Design a protein around this motif. Sequence first.
Motif, PDB file in Angstrom:
ATOM      1  N   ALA A 106    -103.338  66.396 -77.305  1.00  0.00           N
ATOM      2  CA  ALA A 106    -103.018  67.425 -78.291  1.00  0.00           C
ATOM      3  C   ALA A 106    -104.169  68.407 -78.468  1.00  0.00           C
ATOM      4  CB  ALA A 106    -102.654  66.777 -79.625  1.00  0.00           C
ATOM      5  N   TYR A 107    -105.405  67.906 -78.529  1.00  0.00           N
ATOM      6  CA  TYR A 107    -106.536  68.796 -78.775  1.00  0.00           C
ATOM      7  C   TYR A 107    -106.916  69.583 -77.527  1.00  0.00           C
ATOM      8  CZ  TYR A 107    -110.868  70.517 -80.827  1.00  0.00           C
ATOM      9  OH  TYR A 107    -111.867  71.323 -81.321  1.00  0.00           O
ATOM     10  N   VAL A 108    -106.892  68.943 -76.359  1.00  0.00           N
ATOM     11  CA  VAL A 108    -107.315  69.616 -75.136  1.00  0.00           C
ATOM     12  C   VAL A 108    -106.222  70.544 -74.619  1.00  0.00           C
ATOM     13  CG1 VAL A 108    -108.052  69.273 -72.756  1.00  0.00           C
ATOM     14  CG2 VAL A 108    -108.922  67.770 -74.557  1.00  0.00           C
ATOM     15  N   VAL A 109    -105.011  70.019 -74.434  1.00  0.00           N
ATOM     16  CA  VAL A 109    -103.951  70.796 -73.795  1.00  0.00           C
ATOM     17  C   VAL A 109    -103.272  71.720 -74.799  1.00  0.00           C
ATOM     18  CG1 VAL A 109    -101.821  70.662 -72.469  1.00  0.00           C
ATOM     19  CG2 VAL A 109    -103.632  68.975 -72.097  1.00  0.00           C
ATOM     20  N   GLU A 110    -102.748  71.155 -75.886  1.00  0.00           N
ATOM     21  CA  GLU A 110    -101.959  71.951 -76.820  1.00  0.00           C
ATOM     22  C   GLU A 110    -102.843  72.877 -77.649  1.00  0.00           C
ATOM     23  OE1 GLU A 110     -98.789  71.958 -76.605  1.00  0.00           O
ATOM     24  OE2 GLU A 110     -98.453  70.178 -75.368  1.00  0.00           O
ATOM     25  N   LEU A 111    -103.962  72.364 -78.158  1.00  0.00           N
ATOM     26  CA  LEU A 111    -104.770  73.158 -79.078  1.00  0.00           C
ATOM     27  C   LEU A 111    -105.746  74.061 -78.329  1.00  0.00           C
ATOM     28  CD1 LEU A 111    -107.682  73.180 -80.924  1.00  0.00           C
ATOM     29  CD2 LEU A 111    -105.499  74.042 -81.802  1.00  0.00           C
ATOM     30  N   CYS A 112    -106.450  73.522 -77.335  1.00  0.00           N
ATOM     31  CA  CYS A 112    -107.486  74.301 -76.665  1.00  0.00           C
ATOM     32  C   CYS A 112    -106.943  75.178 -75.541  1.00  0.00           C
ATOM     33  CB  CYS A 112    -108.575  73.371 -76.120  1.00  0.00           C
ATOM     34  SG  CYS A 112    -109.694  72.739 -77.396  1.00  0.00           S
ATOM     35  N   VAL A 113    -105.972  74.686 -74.779  1.00  0.00           N
ATOM     36  CA  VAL A 113    -105.476  75.423 -73.624  1.00  0.00           C
ATOM     37  C   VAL A 113    -104.360  76.389 -74.005  1.00  0.00           C
ATOM     38  CG1 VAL A 113    -104.293  75.200 -71.425  1.00  0.00           C
ATOM     39  CG2 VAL A 113    -106.235  73.727 -71.944  1.00  0.00           C
ATOM     40  N   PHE A 114    -103.306  75.895 -74.656  1.00  0.00           N
ATOM     41  CA  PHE A 114    -102.178  76.761 -74.987  1.00  0.00           C
ATOM     42  C   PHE A 114    -102.505  77.697 -76.146  1.00  0.00           C
ATOM     43  CE2 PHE A 114     -98.779  73.595 -73.283  1.00  0.00           C
ATOM     44  CZ  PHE A 114     -99.171  73.897 -71.995  1.00  0.00           C
ATOM     45  N   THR A 115    -103.154  77.182 -77.190  1.00  0.00           N
ATOM     46  CA  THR A 115    -103.338  77.933 -78.430  1.00  0.00           C
ATOM     47  C   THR A 115    -104.587  78.816 -78.418  1.00  0.00           C
ATOM     48  OG1 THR A 115    -102.197  76.155 -79.628  1.00  0.00           O
ATOM     49  CG2 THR A 115    -103.494  77.726 -80.920  1.00  0.00           C
ATOM     50  N   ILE A 116    -105.767  78.205 -78.299  1.00  0.00           N
ATOM     51  CA  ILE A 116    -107.013  78.962 -78.407  1.00  0.00           C
ATOM     52  C   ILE A 116    -107.219  79.862 -77.192  1.00  0.00           C
ATOM     53  CG2 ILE A 116    -109.497  78.804 -78.723  1.00  0.00           C
ATOM     54  CD1 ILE A 116    -109.262  76.471 -80.347  1.00  0.00           C
ATOM     55  N   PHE A 117    -106.921  79.363 -75.990  1.00  0.00           N
ATOM     56  CA  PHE A 117    -107.115  80.185 -74.800  1.00  0.00           C
ATOM     57  C   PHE A 117    -106.058  81.274 -74.674  1.00  0.00           C
ATOM     58  CE2 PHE A 117    -107.721  80.699 -70.086  1.00  0.00           C
ATOM     59  CZ  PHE A 117    -109.043  81.087 -70.167  1.00  0.00           C
ATOM     60  N   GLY A 118    -104.892  81.086 -75.293  1.00  0.00           N
ATOM     61  CA  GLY A 118    -103.948  82.179 -75.442  1.00  0.00           C
ATOM     62  C   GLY A 118    -104.473  83.326 -76.283  1.00  0.00           C
ATOM     63  N   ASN A 119    -105.408  83.041 -77.188  1.00  0.00           N
ATOM     64  CA  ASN A 119    -106.019  84.065 -78.025  1.00  0.00           C
ATOM     65  C   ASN A 119    -107.059  84.914 -77.296  1.00  0.00           C
ATOM     66  OD1 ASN A 119    -106.344  85.455 -80.453  1.00  0.00           O
ATOM     67  ND2 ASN A 119    -106.316  83.552 -81.642  1.00  0.00           N
ATOM     68  N   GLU A 120    -107.260  84.689 -75.996  1.00  0.00           N
ATOM     69  CA  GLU A 120    -108.021  85.543 -75.078  1.00  0.00           C
ATOM     70  C   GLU A 120    -109.543  85.523 -75.188  1.00  0.00           C
ATOM     71  OE1 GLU A 120    -106.739  88.011 -72.521  1.00  0.00           O
ATOM     72  OE2 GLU A 120    -105.334  86.334 -72.732  1.00  0.00           O
ATOM     73  N   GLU A 121    -110.201  84.511 -75.749  1.00  0.00           N
ATOM     74  CA  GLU A 121    -111.662  84.455 -75.645  1.00  0.00           C
ATOM     75  C   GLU A 121    -112.095  83.028 -75.331  1.00  0.00           C
ATOM     76  OE1 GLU A 121    -113.875  85.819 -78.899  1.00  0.00           O
ATOM     77  OE2 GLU A 121    -113.257  84.254 -80.313  1.00  0.00           O
ATOM     78  N   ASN A 122    -112.608  82.811 -74.126  1.00  0.00           N
ATOM     79  CA  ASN A 122    -112.993  81.470 -73.698  1.00  0.00           C
ATOM     80  C   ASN A 122    -114.336  81.022 -74.284  1.00  0.00           C
ATOM     81  OD1 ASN A 122    -112.732  79.002 -72.373  1.00  0.00           O
ATOM     82  ND2 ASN A 122    -113.235  79.806 -70.337  1.00  0.00           N
ATOM     83  N   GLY A 123    -114.955  81.794 -75.180  1.00  0.00           N
ATOM     84  CA  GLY A 123    -116.215  81.347 -75.762  1.00  0.00           C
ATOM     85  C   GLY A 123    -116.032  80.177 -76.715  1.00  0.00           C
ATOM     86  N   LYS A 124    -115.050  80.276 -77.614  1.00  0.00           N
ATOM     87  CA  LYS A 124    -114.771  79.164 -78.514  1.00  0.00           C
ATOM     88  C   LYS A 124    -114.100  78.006 -77.788  1.00  0.00           C
ATOM     89  CE  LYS A 124    -112.127  80.002 -81.856  1.00  0.00           C
ATOM     90  NZ  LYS A 124    -111.360  80.301 -83.099  1.00  0.00           N
ATOM     91  N   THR A 125    -113.295  78.293 -76.759  1.00  0.00           N
ATOM     92  CA  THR A 125    -112.583  77.228 -76.057  1.00  0.00           C
ATOM     93  C   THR A 125    -113.542  76.303 -75.318  1.00  0.00           C
ATOM     94  OG1 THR A 125    -110.706  78.726 -75.779  1.00  0.00           O
ATOM     95  CG2 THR A 125    -110.724  76.702 -74.475  1.00  0.00           C
ATOM     96  N   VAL A 126    -114.541  76.865 -74.636  1.00  0.00           N
ATOM     97  CA  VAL A 126    -115.502  76.030 -73.925  1.00  0.00           C
ATOM     98  C   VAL A 126    -116.329  75.218 -74.912  1.00  0.00           C
ATOM     99  CG1 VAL A 126    -117.458  76.036 -72.356  1.00  0.00           C
ATOM    100  CG2 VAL A 126    -115.549  77.569 -71.959  1.00  0.00           C
TER     101      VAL A 126
END
Lengths: 289, 294
Positions: B27-47
């Motif tokens: 849930a945190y890696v795929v759903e929250l970090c990949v689909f949600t946060i990385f959809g928001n277009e900045e990989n700084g917070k995602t990494v």
Amino acid sequence: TLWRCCQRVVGWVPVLFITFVVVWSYYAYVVELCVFTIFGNEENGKTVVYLVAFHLFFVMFVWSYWMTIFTSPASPSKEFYLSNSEKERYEKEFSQERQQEILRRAARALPIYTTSASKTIRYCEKCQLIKPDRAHHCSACDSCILKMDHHCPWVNNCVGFSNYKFFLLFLLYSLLYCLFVAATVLEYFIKFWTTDTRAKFHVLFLFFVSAMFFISVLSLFSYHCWLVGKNRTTIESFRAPTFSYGPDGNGFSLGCSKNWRQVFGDEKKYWLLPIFSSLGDGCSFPTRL
Amino acid sequence: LWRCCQRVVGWVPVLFITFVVVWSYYAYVVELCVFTIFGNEENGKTVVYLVAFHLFFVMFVWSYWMTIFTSPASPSKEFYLSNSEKERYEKEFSQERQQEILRRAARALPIYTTSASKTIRYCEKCQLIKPDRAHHCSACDSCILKMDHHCPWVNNCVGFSNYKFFLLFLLYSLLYCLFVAATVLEYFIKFWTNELTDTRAKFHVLFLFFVSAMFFISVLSLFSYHCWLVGKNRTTIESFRAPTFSYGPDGNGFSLGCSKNWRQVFGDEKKYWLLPIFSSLGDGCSFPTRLVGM
Ligand SMILES: Nc1ncnc2c1ncn2[C@@H]1O[C@H](COP(=O)(O)OP(=O)(O)O)[C@@H](OP(=O)(O)O)[C@H]1O
Ligand SMILES: [Zn+2]
Ligand SMILES: [Zn+2]
Ligand SMILES: [Zn+2]
Ligand SMILES: [Zn+2]
């Protein structure tokens, strides 16, 4: 008879060799350097910071390396192949003049803007297809590769339109992986020369294997940064493509900024990730003119 | 025999927790970090989130694994009644002389505690003289050194060998849940007020915040209780029934001061304090006393 099985297997030898060095490097840096050496010291903060950072570079390196190996190279679409009727006429024909007429009639229904050095239609005798622009035949892959750059032995695969951005990231994360190791083991490499029996063998090997790979691969990385901005493959860097207006080393160039975006794409978030983001389809390319 | 049934059914709380943790990873890696946060277009917070998450996820699963598979320590063979003493103990019919048999054996052992009735702490099932702070657990079917309590969530007893791992398991559980709650909160806000509306991500982001918040509020009370037990050098059992020494009951009979009490569990080397690697002082069969006698 069974020569295919041994030939196919021996092609993996450079891959298994590199895979061993990487597995050994993980063991050497994590266990010997971080656990025995740095954690042999009473500093828990420096050990964790290095272990976390190392796993980030190690992941991006293995991710890019894996993608460069198993991404199969793209081949020309069904449209570039000679149909079973026209390929008979081509094989039946004995005059090269009439052979060219057969290829020119089919090619003019295709997005082709380049010819051979003799201004003949770029055709593959083995694949029996008309090569798309920037595509070349590789006798190792035994196929035509779209925007072929070179058959890289270290990944047992061709580096073409599908692989190129992964291959570049593989180089990028190779320098970063090796630079980070060299920069962090150095402080302890100085100590090791100036006493653990097992730790020294791996730490000593760690520093200059990372340094040798850094100085070596760094040359290739600067080489390709030129190539991406010029929109030229390695093959084209030796033989500039011949267009309707003659040879032109810059025939596919769209400017430095737009050339990079052909490989890495318009999505800024995918530039550093081994996820396919290259523009186009590999069978046709924007022309400078 | 239902002892076989106990072994299989005992893993149910362990497998259940394993499911929630594996689900939380997805849930945190795929759903929250990949689909949600990385959809928001900045990989700084995602990494940053993906890197930080793997640090807490590793320390949590490492501590949890150690608390489960670290076998509980048992008394040394010296504490067992020899084949000679088990005979004369079994022959006797007067309880008074039975204690004398146990007392003679106990005086050859580093034992400084007795029962509430000033009798030798003896285990009828194991046929051994219980070391100080040791107790018998019918779930483990054994005597456990410095037994704290039998834990169903790890299908194991928390004793002398487990305790520091169990404590780290609680610590990294709170941190894991706090990190999840603190980072998913900003995105938990979005799903309720419909800034984000993804069907699959909504179920996992909402459940991520609730489950992490519910586990945090619960385990935090337990964790603070054990931080106080360690400073008092008391097991959970002792905090309800103070041990009886030669001079009577004393809840602080094993106390050596706050600083030294923590060092009994975590050791003197700070590098092992936060790591699920055994660093507890002593052997579990004897413990320093506040007054005299070890
Ligand atoms: N079979 C058991 N299962 C779970 N807990 C036990 C068991 N036997 C003893 N205990 C623990 O030890 C206590 C039971 O009585 P004892 O002091 O005689 O211990 P013991 O018989 O195990 O050596 C219980 O704690 P409490 O009375 O303060 O509430 C219990 O936690
Ligand atoms: Zn070909
Ligand atoms: Zn090839
Ligand atoms: Zn017992
Ligand atoms: Zn138990």
